[PDB]
């Protein structure tokens, strides 16, 4: 991630990110709402960073240093560019809402009052169709990606050296190839938990409570559609195994 955003999201909470003199100006219920919105944006920034490790560090490094057979890099990182496009756009909208809310003369003091509408937009229309199509494809290729990775790590010397080299730094401790794939698969099921807790502290403005209630319903519809469209692809599995499922 870029330094500006890392520093803006370095604190453990919104209450520790803002100036203490600004924090004292708000009601307890507003602080609780803002701490959960801050967790949503902070975890989205980390999720976009996970996708950049996959595209820039792993995928690009394999294309430029290794001699893998055609279709091997795509098999290891299915839909990574589409996933990166979905979440970089969503992150941009979240950070723009925070930017507009900043007090003049401050780069850290803000309150986001209107998150619901942004969530309805992200989880409806063409963007929800693209998230559904992309996650149904990615999650159906999850098992195949893990098996392909294990085969290459155990049989290809240059691939093993590459992985050991690029995952050596301490900042990559939680982000090996398989770990990135599971971080991405688990991301979509974190949204209802975060949205429901934001909703719990958003009763102050009835239109906001209504918007978050609609957004939560849309996220659950998306998850149900993705879950119903998954079937693990298996390299080598015969047609008979498939039509007899």
């Amino acid at each position: 991630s870029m330094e500006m955003d890392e520093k803006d999201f370095a604190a453990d909470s919104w209450s520790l990110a803002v100036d203490s003199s600004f924090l004292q100006q708000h009601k307890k219920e507003v602080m609780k709402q803002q701490d959960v919105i801050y967790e949503l944006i902070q975890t989205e920034l980390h999720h976009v960073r996970t996708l950049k490790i996959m595209t820039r560090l792993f995928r690009t490094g394999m294309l430029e240093e290794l001699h893998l057979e055609p279709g091997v890099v795509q098999g290891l990182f299915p839909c990574v560019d589409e996933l990166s496009d979905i979440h970089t756009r969503f992150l941009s909208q979240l950070l723009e809402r925070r930017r507009q809310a900043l007090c003049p003369g401050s780069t850290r003091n803000f309150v986001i009052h209107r998150l619901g509408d942004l969530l309805i937009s992200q989880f409806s229309g063409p963007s929800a169709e693209q998230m559904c199509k992309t996650y149904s494809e990615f999650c159906s290729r999850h098992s195949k990606a893990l098996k392909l990775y294990k085969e290459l790590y155990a049989r290809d010397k240059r691939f093993q050296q590459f992985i050991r080299k690029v995952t050596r730094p301490a900042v990559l401790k939680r982000h090996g190839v398989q770990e990135c794939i599971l971080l991405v698969t688990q991301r979509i099921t974190k949204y209802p938990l975060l949205i429901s807790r934001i909703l719990q502290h958003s009763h102050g403005i009835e239109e906001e409570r209504q918007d978050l209630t609609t957004a939560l319903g849309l996220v659950k519809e998306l998850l149900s559609n993705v879950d119903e469209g998954i079937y693990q692809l298996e390299k080598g599995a015969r047609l008979q195994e498939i039509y007899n499922r």
Binding site: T43, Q178, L182, T185, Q186, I188, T189, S224, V226
Partner: protein, 179 residues
């Protein structure tokens, strides 16, 4: 330092997310309790052996039967959680979770963990449960369920006070290292 993978399973209200957060920070959050847990790699030394233990939560995956099993590949130890303030979470252990974990994680050790043990002698908890003709899970009821499901062992902890938390993860590491 060998790498091992741990996954925690159980009902939405079993306290699994809180347990992972408290262990990974070695502290119950004083300012903000996070809603979610991404992942973590804990450095643990148990009985003279150094291990890198990757931690994963299944929170949010309970209603999605095709997304949820994606968390299981290559798991080395399972923590199967229930809340001591909820006899209903204990009843779902042999019903749903055990046959699922034995299917996707064959021969992987399972540790049955009773969470929120601080609530066993909490007056508000005892008054609330008595309205539905219930009581906090007794330690022997936990042991019997663990024996019944063929768990590697039975343990209890409180993420609130941290008691038993270190012990749970050190024992999980020992189970992950076994043949």
């Amino acid at each position: 330092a060998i790498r091992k993978k741990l996954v925690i399973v159980g009902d939405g209200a079993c306290g699994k997310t809180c347990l992972l957060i408290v262990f990974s920070k070695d502290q119950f959050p004083e300012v903000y309790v996070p809603t979610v847990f991404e992942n973590y790699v804990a450095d643990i030394e148990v009985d003279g052996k150094q291990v890198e233990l990757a931690l994963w939560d299944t929170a949010g995956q309970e209603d999605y039967d095709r997304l949820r099993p994606l968390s299981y590949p290559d798991t080395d130890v399972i923590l199967m959680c229930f809340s001591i303030d909820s006899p209903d979470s204990l009843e779902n252990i042999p019903e749903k979770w055990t046959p699922e974990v034995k299917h996707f994680c064959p021969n992987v050790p399972i540790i049955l963990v009773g969470n929120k043990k601080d609530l066993r002698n909490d007056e508000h908890t005892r008054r609330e449960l008595a309205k539905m003709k219930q009581e906090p899970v007794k330690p022997e009821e936990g042991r019997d369920m663990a024996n019944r499901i063929g768990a590697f062992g039975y343990m209890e902890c409180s993420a609130k006070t941290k008691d038993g938390v270190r012990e749970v993860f050190e024992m999980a590491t020992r189970a992950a290292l076994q043949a």
